[PDB]
Write an enzyme that holds these catalytic residues in place. Structure first.
Site, PDB file in Angstrom:
ATOM      1  N   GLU A  35      18.488  33.444  60.888  1.00  0.00           N
ATOM      2  CA  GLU A  35      18.725  33.574  59.997  1.00  0.00           C
ATOM      3  C   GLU A  35      18.714  35.003  59.257  1.00  0.00           C
ATOM      4  O   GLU A  35      19.556  35.573  58.210  1.00  0.00           O
ATOM      5  CB  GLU A  35      17.803  32.622  58.345  1.00  0.00           C
ATOM      6  CG  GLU A  35      17.281  31.391  59.225  1.00  0.00           C
ATOM      7  CD  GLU A  35      18.873  30.832  57.400  1.00  0.00           C
ATOM      8  OE1 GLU A  35      19.292  31.455  57.451  1.00  0.00           O
ATOM      9  OE2 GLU A  35      18.794  29.371  57.799  1.00  0.00           O
ATOM     10  N   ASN A  46      25.820  33.777  49.214  1.00  0.00           N
ATOM     11  CA  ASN A  46      26.439  32.903  48.886  1.00  0.00           C
ATOM     12  C   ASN A  46      27.847  32.420  48.784  1.00  0.00           C
ATOM     13  O   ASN A  46      27.723  33.281  47.747  1.00  0.00           O
ATOM     14  CB  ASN A  46      25.345  31.155  48.892  1.00  0.00           C
ATOM     15  CG  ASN A  46      23.967  31.180  49.533  1.00  0.00           C
ATOM     16  OD1 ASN A  46      24.123  31.587  50.851  1.00  0.00           O
ATOM     17  ND2 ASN A  46      22.807  31.975  49.369  1.00  0.00           N
ATOM     18  N   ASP A  48      28.205  29.675  46.225  1.00  0.00           N
ATOM     19  CA  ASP A  48      28.287  29.502  45.410  1.00  0.00           C
ATOM     20  C   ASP A  48      27.336  30.760  44.047  1.00  0.00           C
ATOM     21  O   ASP A  48      27.361  31.002  42.871  1.00  0.00           O
ATOM     22  CB  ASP A  48      27.235  28.612  44.662  1.00  0.00           C
ATOM     23  CG  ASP A  48      25.366  29.156  45.473  1.00  0.00           C
ATOM     24  OD1 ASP A  48      25.236  30.304  45.994  1.00  0.00           O
ATOM     25  OD2 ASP A  48      24.670  28.160  45.191  1.00  0.00           O
ATOM     26  N   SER A  50      24.768  32.848  44.629  1.00  0.00           N
ATOM     27  CA  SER A  50      23.672  32.671  44.822  1.00  0.00           C
ATOM     28  C   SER A  50      23.132  33.394  46.299  1.00  0.00           C
ATOM     29  O   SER A  50      24.297  34.006  47.007  1.00  0.00           O
ATOM     30  CB  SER A  50      22.853  31.628  45.286  1.00  0.00           C
ATOM     31  OG  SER A  50      23.696  31.185  46.304  1.00  0.00           O
ATOM     32  N   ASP A  52      20.615  34.215  49.700  1.00  0.00           N
ATOM     33  CA  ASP A  52      19.710  34.195  50.869  1.00  0.00           C
ATOM     34  C   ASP A  52      18.362  35.757  50.716  1.00  0.00           C
ATOM     35  O   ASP A  52      19.026  36.574  50.740  1.00  0.00           O
ATOM     36  CB  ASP A  52      20.194  33.486  51.789  1.00  0.00           C
ATOM     37  CG  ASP A  52      20.535  32.010  51.625  1.00  0.00           C
ATOM     38  OD1 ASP A  52      20.484  31.751  50.534  1.00  0.00           O
ATOM     39  OD2 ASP A  52      21.138  31.880  53.101  1.00  0.00           O
ATOM     40  N   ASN A  59      16.394  30.864  49.130  1.00  0.00           N
ATOM     41  CA  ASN A  59      18.035  30.827  48.263  1.00  0.00           C
ATOM     42  C   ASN A  59      17.719  31.183  46.948  1.00  0.00           C
ATOM     43  O   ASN A  59      17.038  29.944  46.449  1.00  0.00           O
ATOM     44  CB  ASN A  59      18.804  29.792  48.829  1.00  0.00           C
ATOM     45  CG  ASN A  59      19.846  29.017  48.178  1.00  0.00           C
ATOM     46  OD1 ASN A  59      20.343  30.282  47.206  1.00  0.00           O
ATOM     47  ND2 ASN A  59      21.285  28.757  48.243  1.00  0.00           N
TER      48      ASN A  59
HETATM   49 AU    AU Z   1      21.799  36.204  61.125  1.00  0.00          AU
HETATM   50 NA    NA Z   2      22.341  32.913  57.258  1.00  0.00          NA
END
Ligand code: AU
Ligand code: NA
Ligand code: AU
Ligand code: AU
Ligand code: CL
Length: 129
Positions: A35, A46, A48, A50, A52, A59
């Site tokens: 992540e 994202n 949409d 949004s 993260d 999110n």
């Molecule tokens: Au990554």
């Molecule tokens: Na990611």
């Protein structure tokens, strides 16, 4: 802050994620790796519109308020900027609500695509926990 692997393992364990809703510590470390590369300051947009935020890429669509995600919820009742702190308390406490919401760790598409069904114990190999 960019955590070391074992440093993050220890922080997540201290914060009660080891076997939280049945997910071993290795799952959480694996998720954070793919992540955020263990970087508390990680942000990604994202499709949409949004965003993260933080070590677990939480999110704005559902979990936090960044002031620019129209038709979104703030289910962790936090500003998204709290998820970028060198202190992972807000990320961990929010992740606990997320993984409890019915889909377990499948809520993190990178966990499902890159951690699920793999030897996640490798992520905590050699760490003093
Ligand atoms: Au990554
Ligand atoms: Na990611
Ligand atoms: Au438990
Ligand atoms: Au596994
Ligand atoms: Cl809160």
């Amino acid at each position: 802050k960019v955590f070391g692997r074992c440093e993050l393992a220890a922080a997540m364990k201290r914060h009660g994620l080891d076997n939280y809703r049945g997910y071993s510590l290795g799952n959480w470390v694996c998720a954070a790796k793919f992540e955020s590369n263990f970087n508390t300051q990680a942000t990604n947009r994202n499709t949409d519109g949004s965003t993260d935020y933080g070590i677990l890429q939480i999110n704005s669509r559902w979990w936090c308020n960044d002031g620019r995600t129209p038709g979104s919820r703030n289910l962790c009742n936090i500003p998204c900027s709290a998820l970028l702190s060198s202190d992972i308390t807000a990320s961990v406490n929010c992740a606990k609500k997320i993984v409890s919401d019915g889909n377990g760790m499948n809520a993190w598409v990178a966990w499902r695509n890159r951690c699920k069904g793999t030897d996640v114990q490798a992520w905590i190999r050699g760490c003093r926990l």
